[PDB]
Amino acid sequence: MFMINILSLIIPILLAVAFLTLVERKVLGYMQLRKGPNVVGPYGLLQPIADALKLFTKEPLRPATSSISMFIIAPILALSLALTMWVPLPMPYPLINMNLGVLFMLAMSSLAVYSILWSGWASNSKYALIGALRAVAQTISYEVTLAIILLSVLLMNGSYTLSTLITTQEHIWMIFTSWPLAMMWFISTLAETNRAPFDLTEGESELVSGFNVEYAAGPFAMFFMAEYANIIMMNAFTAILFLGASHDPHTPELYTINFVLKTLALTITFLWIRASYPRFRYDQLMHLLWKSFLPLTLALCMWHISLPIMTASIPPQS
Amino acid sequence: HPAAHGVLRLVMELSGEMVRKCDPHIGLLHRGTEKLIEYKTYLQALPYFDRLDYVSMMCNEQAYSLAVEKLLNIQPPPRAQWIRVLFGEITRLLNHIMAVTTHALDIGAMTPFFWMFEEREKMFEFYERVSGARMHAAYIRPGGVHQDLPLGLLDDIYEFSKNFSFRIDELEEMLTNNRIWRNRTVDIGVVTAEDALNYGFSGVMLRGSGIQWDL
Amino acid sequence: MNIMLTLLTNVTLASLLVLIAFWLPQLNAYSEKTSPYECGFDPMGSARLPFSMKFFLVAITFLLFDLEIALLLPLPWASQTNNLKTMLTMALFLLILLAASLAYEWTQKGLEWAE
Amino acid sequence: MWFEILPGIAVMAACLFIPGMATAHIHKFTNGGKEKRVAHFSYQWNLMERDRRISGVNRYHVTKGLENID
Amino acid sequence: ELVQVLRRGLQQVSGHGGLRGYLRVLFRANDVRVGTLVGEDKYGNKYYEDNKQFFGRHRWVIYTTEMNGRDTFWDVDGSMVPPEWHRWLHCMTDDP
Amino acid sequence: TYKFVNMREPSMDMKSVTDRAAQTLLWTELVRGLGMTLSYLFREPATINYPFEKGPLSPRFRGEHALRRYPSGEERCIACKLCEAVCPAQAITIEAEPRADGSRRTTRYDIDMTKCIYCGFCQEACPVDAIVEGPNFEFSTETHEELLYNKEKLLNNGDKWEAEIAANIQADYLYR
Amino acid sequence: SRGEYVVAKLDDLVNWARRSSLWPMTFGLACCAVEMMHMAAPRYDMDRFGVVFRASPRQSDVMIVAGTLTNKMAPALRKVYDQMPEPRYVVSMGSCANGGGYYHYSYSVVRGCDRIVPVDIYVPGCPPTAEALLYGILQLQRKIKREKRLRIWYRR
Amino acid sequence: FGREDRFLNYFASMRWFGGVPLISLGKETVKQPVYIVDVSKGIINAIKDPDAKGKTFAFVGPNRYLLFDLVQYIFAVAYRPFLPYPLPHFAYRWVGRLFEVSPFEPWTTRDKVERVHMSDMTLPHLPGLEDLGIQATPLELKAIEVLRRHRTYRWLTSEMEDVKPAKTVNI
Ligand SMILES: CCCCCCCCCCCCCCCCC[C@@H](O)O[C@H](CO[C@H](O)CCCCCCCCCCCCCCC)COP(=O)(O)OCC[N+](C)(C)C
Ligand SMILES: CCCCCCCCCCCCCCCCC[C@@H](O)O[C@H](CO[C@H](O)CCCCCCCCCCCCCCC)COP(=O)(O)OCC[N+](C)(C)C
Ligand SMILES: CCCCCCCC/C=C\CCCCCCCC(=O)O[C@H](COC(=O)CCCCCCC/C=C/CCCCCCCC)COP(=O)(O)OCCN
Ligand SMILES: COC1=C(OC)C(=O)C(CC=C(C)C)=C(C)C1=O
Ligand SMILES: COC1=C(OC)C(=O)C(CC=C(C)C)=C(C)C1=O
Ligand code: SF4
Ligand code: SF4
Ligand code: SF4
């Protein structure tokens, strides 16, 4: 019965990723005065299936100079980690109920960077290497401030349990209490998912295909699926953390509908942002995250430690 | 390479991502045009100037025609010269759309390219209506122009021109005041006026350094 | 047990996708096809040569700033103590010390990348 | 169209609906229809273990009320 | 005015001869606009115009399902247009 | 006459300084760019439904070449070789001899379409409107040899496209 | 036979997937690449057919030779053709790539890219219009609809 | 033998398993392989030779090798560890039969095993390559162009004159 739950989680997520590819193409097309996919299937509804079937029937290449073991391990790690980061999300009930869900997401996301690191190194080509060192720099840029923002926001939750976030925001969204932290968190999640304007690792104009330039076919497809699953997962985490849906214990379907709508809106905002802006230089991302975000985050952390004590508004569950 | 702007083998020397030396290797599109011109008549050599700078065709035709007219000691009729200047300015608009939108695309802004290439398409329609070819018309000739305008072309040119400023405004709203665009462009590739003059620069590459020159 | 089963399932699915990707299609490998990509020309040196790090000093600072995150994570539980005056003094002491270290490195040009 | 983007969004929404609803229904089906117990601490786990022992069918969910105390 | 748009969609469905013709024109041409019939070829191609559309979409052709020897229910191309309708369709003249 | 593009100076009063601080901290210009993209999202796209819809052309358009006839069916070409002389790509090859009835006609008229630059010089040079560039542009092939036209292919193209070629010529010959 | 029916259906499915998802290399040489960009422009929107440019050769399915191929360039073009995983297709666009064109008699120009790589479709013109390149792409799609790989394997 | 050959390539494929199974350890098999370009040139010359109408030719290489030495040289040029172990004829035949059931191109067959462990005949009464103007190319000058693909990254740049040609049982 638990395996049925695992499958009912992981298969719909892959289908959502497949159709998010089409939705992104159509949103970008219509923001660019064109249409996007509308031929293969009514309204391009069969385009993701054609893409997947073309990729998995295409020859996979193992580079002559590459390390083969790491070259094959990296996409497996990427996809499995992207699938695993979904299990503690309460929708309104989680698949795996943890005391410290937030720390689990933190650790698994910080493990996910080694997929890019090891694929870029194991390709044994120059553009892949440049992509990998850009990944190193990006993680160094965003990690500390991301963690401090999470701590500051959760100081009103009372714990690290994700389900407590539903009862914390029973009356008001957490975005009305910490909107500067919400802004910094949104930019941090854009940087954490290698999304425009922070899509430095791929670096398409600058680095051809970057870290995954050597990759082709099915192995290449796995990287794409992992990235888009990460997009959806991070936006769902943001929706749970800042726009809290109201949960009726006798009707969880209403909560599920509302939460799915909110995360879809955040994902569409990601696509909008990609369509609207140019790319950062990767030293400029580090300067932004270390000279503007970090001091404000430290000050707001001090403020959010002090405020519940001053106002006698400390949450329960020591 | 997507950012190589065609066929360029730019051999680069780097310490980390810093650039120590740039060594542009060219000739990947050297087709031996000048010898071929030496094997043709003056009318036969004219279409080569279309394919020299394939973003500004009629301007190249105009330069070659002016040179041949100077060597012939003849003068084009006034209507031909007005048509030439009109289509030269249309060509300048085409070239500047290409330059700005592809620069933005390299830097990472993809949308203005799509917005402005529709205007490029309409101007290609003007090219084809006057000559039958969208980009290598060969309309401007040493004695003037090949054919007169069709009876309803000026109206459509006016209709395009009365609306193009809003498209420019939308592009400007996307780029000019964006802090990411300014971070990627301000203080990048600074060149002094004297160095620009000595290195043989021309056009915007002189005007951006304050030199008040325009042919 | 449930988390172990989830990890096993996800890793198995990814491995099966790799296996299908490598055994289903027709393979035609020859030396030119598998050579390294450098935009159509052969690379000069090796990709295993040393690659300079211009932000090396910030990377070391990341190691120290990361450990102060571990010191600040227990703060939600620390807010439940009876002596809230000692805890609040110590939480601010740690955060002020962390801001002072950023201010020191910033003013000594430690955040600027090497050229 | 712009309303032709909607079918893909609807398909994605239907796909994303499945995990939460499936988890809720599977939790209800394997816990007597009453919202699977949460045990974040040892006291709740002890309560669950005690319930399992007195049920007589080795299941924590079956509940013995006032009819089990004669 | 949303109801006006929805009713316009329902009359688009009805104007293609019902659901069967609507789906045929949606899967063959990926377009369900209804225009005014200008004429028909001897090969079976039909030609439509709708002057309310912008320049480029105001004329179109629904290709025949059978030309000289091949089944063209799915496989169509611009070279199946005869020269006279070729001149009309590419807007080189105003007269069909 | 000249103008400056980047020679302005910002105001230093409290009102404008706070305005710029709010721009820095609340991302107003980025919101404006997002708004422009949102505005474009709700416009009608410029895409046409090819091949059911076609792009607009004109009577002067230069397409695939053809050889024409007089209304009686006699060929127009008289083997003057002006088109061969003027062709900037040397794509035309011609041979000729007196026909069995004494007419001046060709025995070879070849156009290498992979040499042709589609400049239209040949149809300007022709004194009898025998060689033209017709309106067809959809004639891609699967082999290289199918694009080396001989006289039979060009005459077949003329017979195939005359109904449109004559109308196109009627619409432009007064500009020529 | 049952096996013939099964292989015919599988061949149909694979061919449909291949032709509906055609990713060309981001690769252009000369004048013809401007018309390629105009084919990617909103009016024609090649992306609506499933055609998407990708920069890396390992992630590309079609190579469009758009412009003159010179002798200095030919080894690079061959090299990025070799690094395309199979199946792969080549489209020759423009007179220069078809047979040399205006520069056919030059000392530094390859007289047609088909001396260096095998070509599936030839698109005529100098340059071909974006509509003509779209016609050639759809012709390549129709050609991919016609291949019989699994049927021929079964007949072996 | 050549770049697309089923000879040198076939031996290279065996390394994945671990050891190289050889009947009688390959000490009773003699091979005389010939380069592909030599064969193609010989065919072209036989077309243009008016004297070769009803003739019968034998195209063989300049050297004869024991199978053990040939496989050892192949593994040395590819810089792979060579692990030869003797397998009885029946056992090898059984293995060959199992591979044959592949609906695709089989990795090996019973017939392939038979032909691999069969000595090359000597037919000195037939004309050869040298009677068509061809000087046969030795394996030691063309092995690298076939086996450099089978090396790891560590040995990819090793040159041709590094791998110490094998011993030939000639005369
Ligand atoms: C989404 C994830 C879950 C999906 C669930 C399904 C997972 C499927 C498992 C993954 C593999 C899928 C690949 C399917 C194609 C078959 C590949 C391989 O297994 O077949 C051949 C395996 O056969 C071997 O070559 C030898 C034949 C069998 C070996 C004998 C071993 C002893 C078994 C006993 C057989 C006796 C009868 C069996 C019935 C009892 C390999 O041939 P090869 O050409 O290299 O590889 C390329 C395949 N091509 C041709 C299609 C391109
Ligand atoms: C279980 C997971 C692994 C397998 C995944 C399989 C995914 C499901 C398959 C998706 C089926 C949809 C494909 C068919 C849609 C084509 C629509 C129609 O148009 O196709 C026509 C005919 O289609 C083809 O002739 C046949 C396509 C399908 C072939 C048989 C279906 C086989 C399904 C079996 C699935 C089992 C997978 C294998 C499991 C191991 C040809 O028209 P087309 O050229 O496009 O369009 C012309 C363009 N116009 C219209 C604008 C003018
Ligand atoms: C009564 C007690 C209350 C205590 C005080 C509380 C009020 C505090 C008010 C101030 C809060 C401001 C928070 C803003 C944090 C960042 C501000 C900032 O300055 O960052 C910018 C940079 O920020 C950015 O530009 C973002 C870059 C990435 C942009 C990507 C797209 C933009 C996002 C679209 C909308 C996002 C919506 C966020 C929330 C989503 C919902 C969660 C600085 O960069 P520069 O202008 O170059 O100057 C620095 C050196 N002088
Ligand atoms: C106008 O300048 C040019 C480019 O920059 C926009 C190109 O990218 C390219 C080629 C690369 C793309 C894929 C068209 C060419 C040929 C070119 O001329
Ligand atoms: C937005 O996607 C596109 C690209 O990726 C960045 C391109 O490179 C190109 C080719 C033009 C550049 C300058 C190479 C086009 C046309 C395009 O649409
Ligand atoms: S159009 Fe120009 S290049 Fe082509 S055949 Fe005529 S004259 Fe020659
Ligand atoms: S086609 Fe015209 S110009 Fe050419 S040879 Fe014939 S008559 Fe003369
Ligand atoms: S065929 Fe014509 S348009 Fe194309 S690259 Fe050559 S000269 Fe330029």
Short mmCIF file of N, CA, C and O in Angstrom, two decimals, chain A residues 50-76:
data_model
loop_
_atom_site.label_atom_id
_atom_site.label_comp_id
_atom_site.label_asym_id
_atom_site.label_seq_id
_atom_site.Cartn_x
_atom_site.Cartn_y
_atom_site.Cartn_z
N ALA A 50 6.22 13.27 -27.92
CA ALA A 50 7.12 13.17 -29.06
C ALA A 50 8.56 13.48 -28.66
O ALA A 50 9.49 12.79 -29.09
N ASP A 51 8.76 14.50 -27.83
CA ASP A 51 10.10 14.83 -27.37
C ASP A 51 10.73 13.67 -26.61
O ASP A 51 11.88 13.29 -26.86
N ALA A 52 9.98 13.08 -25.67
CA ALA A 52 10.51 11.99 -24.87
C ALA A 52 10.80 10.76 -25.72
O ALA A 52 11.85 10.12 -25.57
N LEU A 53 9.89 10.41 -26.63
CA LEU A 53 10.12 9.25 -27.49
C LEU A 53 11.29 9.47 -28.44
O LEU A 53 12.04 8.52 -28.71
N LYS A 54 11.46 10.68 -28.95
CA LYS A 54 12.62 10.97 -29.79
C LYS A 54 13.91 10.86 -28.99
O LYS A 54 14.91 10.33 -29.49
N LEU A 55 13.91 11.36 -27.76
CA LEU A 55 15.14 11.32 -26.97
C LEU A 55 15.50 9.90 -26.56
O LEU A 55 16.67 9.52 -26.60
N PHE A 56 14.52 9.08 -26.20
CA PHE A 56 14.87 7.75 -25.71
C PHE A 56 15.10 6.73 -26.82
O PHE A 56 15.43 5.58 -26.52
N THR A 57 14.92 7.13 -28.07
CA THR A 57 15.21 6.26 -29.20
C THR A 57 16.45 6.77 -29.95
O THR A 57 16.78 6.29 -31.03
N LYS A 58 17.13 7.74 -29.36
CA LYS A 58 18.32 8.36 -29.94
C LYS A 58 19.57 7.80 -29.28
O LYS A 58 19.57 7.48 -28.10
N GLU A 59 20.63 7.68 -30.06
CA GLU A 59 21.89 7.14 -29.57
C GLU A 59 22.54 7.96 -28.46
O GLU A 59 22.61 9.18 -28.55
N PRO A 60 22.99 7.29 -27.40
CA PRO A 60 23.67 7.92 -26.28
C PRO A 60 25.17 7.80 -26.49
O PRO A 60 25.66 6.73 -26.83
N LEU A 61 25.90 8.89 -26.30
CA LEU A 61 27.33 8.90 -26.53
C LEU A 61 28.19 8.92 -25.28
O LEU A 61 27.92 9.67 -24.34
N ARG A 62 29.22 8.09 -25.26
CA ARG A 62 30.15 8.10 -24.15
C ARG A 62 31.41 8.72 -24.72
O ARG A 62 32.02 8.16 -25.62
N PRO A 63 31.81 9.88 -24.18
CA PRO A 63 33.00 10.55 -24.70
C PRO A 63 34.27 9.74 -24.48
O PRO A 63 34.42 9.07 -23.46
N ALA A 64 35.17 9.80 -25.45
CA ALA A 64 36.43 9.05 -25.38
C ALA A 64 37.29 9.44 -24.19
O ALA A 64 37.90 8.58 -23.56
N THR A 65 37.37 10.73 -23.90
CA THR A 65 38.18 11.24 -22.80
C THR A 65 37.50 11.23 -21.43
O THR A 65 38.16 11.42 -20.42
N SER A 66 36.19 11.02 -21.39
CA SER A 66 35.43 11.04 -20.14
C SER A 66 35.57 9.86 -19.18
O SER A 66 35.90 8.75 -19.57
N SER A 67 35.32 10.14 -17.90
CA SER A 67 35.30 9.12 -16.86
C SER A 67 33.90 8.58 -17.06
O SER A 67 32.94 9.34 -17.04
N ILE A 68 33.77 7.27 -17.21
CA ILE A 68 32.46 6.72 -17.56
C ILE A 68 31.59 6.52 -16.32
O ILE A 68 30.37 6.75 -16.37
N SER A 69 32.19 6.13 -15.19
CA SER A 69 31.39 5.82 -14.00
C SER A 69 30.69 7.06 -13.47
O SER A 69 29.48 7.05 -13.23
N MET A 70 31.44 8.15 -13.28
CA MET A 70 30.84 9.40 -12.84
C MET A 70 29.92 9.97 -13.91
O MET A 70 28.86 10.54 -13.58
N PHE A 71 30.29 9.81 -15.18
CA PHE A 71 29.49 10.29 -16.29
C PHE A 71 28.10 9.67 -16.28
O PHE A 71 27.12 10.32 -16.65
N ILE A 72 28.00 8.41 -15.86
CA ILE A 72 26.71 7.75 -15.78
C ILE A 72 26.03 7.99 -14.43
O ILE A 72 24.80 8.09 -14.37
N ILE A 73 26.81 8.14 -13.36
CA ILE A 73 26.23 8.32 -12.03
C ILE A 73 25.51 9.66 -11.93
O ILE A 73 24.44 9.75 -11.31
N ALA A 74 26.08 10.72 -12.52
CA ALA A 74 25.55 12.06 -12.27
C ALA A 74 24.07 12.23 -12.63
O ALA A 74 23.32 12.74 -11.78
N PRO A 75 23.59 11.85 -13.82
CA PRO A 75 22.15 12.01 -14.09
C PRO A 75 21.26 11.15 -13.21
O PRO A 75 20.14 11.58 -12.88
N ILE A 76 21.71 9.95 -12.82
CA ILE A 76 20.93 9.12 -11.91
C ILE A 76 20.74 9.84 -10.59
O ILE A 76 19.63 9.89 -10.04
#
